[PDB]
């Protein structure tokens with residue numbers, strides 16, 4: 001809907017700032033997860049800080065009927081098989097919380113703020129890691145490494161997501177082969193390339209800046225979730241040129257302009273485990289003041305003292321491999337055609353989006369720039 005698209009757009013903007021500052025690195029974020037934590041921050045914000053957040057995000061969770069929308073969204077995504085996701089706010093145990101913040105987090109997120117003794121950073125780390133692990137079924141067992149929290153840490157918003165998908169149609173691992181992937185370096189490296197032929201939802205598009213590109217869709221079993229793979233046509237045009245195609249409306253027009261068509265698709269097998277501290281990106285988006293001791297207004301969290309965000313952290317993890325619906329065939333029925341099936345091989349950096357179709361939410365937005373890394 002309208003506000004789903006606003007969340008998707010806000011999260012893709014964060015994604016687009018992240019890749020702009022690190023064009024050569026593998027990166028997976030969760031637009032849903034990012035909107036979720038900044039939605040938590042909104043519940044605590046007041047005055048100019050609320051106004052700032054609401055204007056950058058495009059909506060306000062403090063407005064009538066909005067907590068129920070956040071809550072149903074969160075409920076629908078978390079209930080997907082394969083999805084383990086956790087968001088929460090961790091606040092120093094010494095701070096006296098306002099009831100309104102408690103009531104807001106319960107109404108929109110069915111959560112409570114988690115009080116942490118940050119004056120003992122290594123204990124705080126173990127407590128936060130165990131909580132995150134318990135709430136992701138162990139899939140994110142050590143959310144934070146040492147050196148992130150300090151004794152000065154007061155308020156942390158975090159989101160953790162692991163996703164184990166099963167393709168509707170399995171890849172045959174016997175069809176997986178070492179083939180060359182071209183990095184932004186110009187260098188070529190040989191990696192396992194999974195391959196399959198099937199009728200694929202497929203479209204060709206051109207960006208605003210006249211860059212020609214394709215998008216191809218691959219469903220997980222159930223078809224509530226599917227991955228969209230997006231890449232420049234020309235092998236020597238960088239992935240960067242596409243950063244601004246990623247909007248919820250552009251995704252809407254991809255879905256109505258795409259049609260099924262036989263294709264031989266080859267894509268690297270890869271895993272990503274991306275940890276990100278979102279300060280630098282959010283500040284590039286104009287949200288720097290939420291981190292400022294002098295300018296941030298979280299009066300809804302506490303009125304007894306100044307308070308600004310210490311950290312906004314996300315960790316996202318997924319493994320993309322051959323696994324498909326058990327006992328299903330890797331291969332279509334043999335239909336003869338004088339039509340040569342076009343090959344699409346993803347042997348240069350590409351975007352991948354993983355979308356929940358009922359809500360339209362993006363569980364992931366990532367770029368693969370080097371398949372041999374996480």
Ligand SMILES: *[C@@H]1O[C@H](CO)[C@@H](O)[C@H](O)[C@H]1NC(C)=O
Pocket residue numbers: 024183184185187370
């Ligand atoms: C590119 O630089 C050299 C080869 O040109 C290599 O050692 C390095 O790891 C490459 N980096 C990436 C990200 O492919």
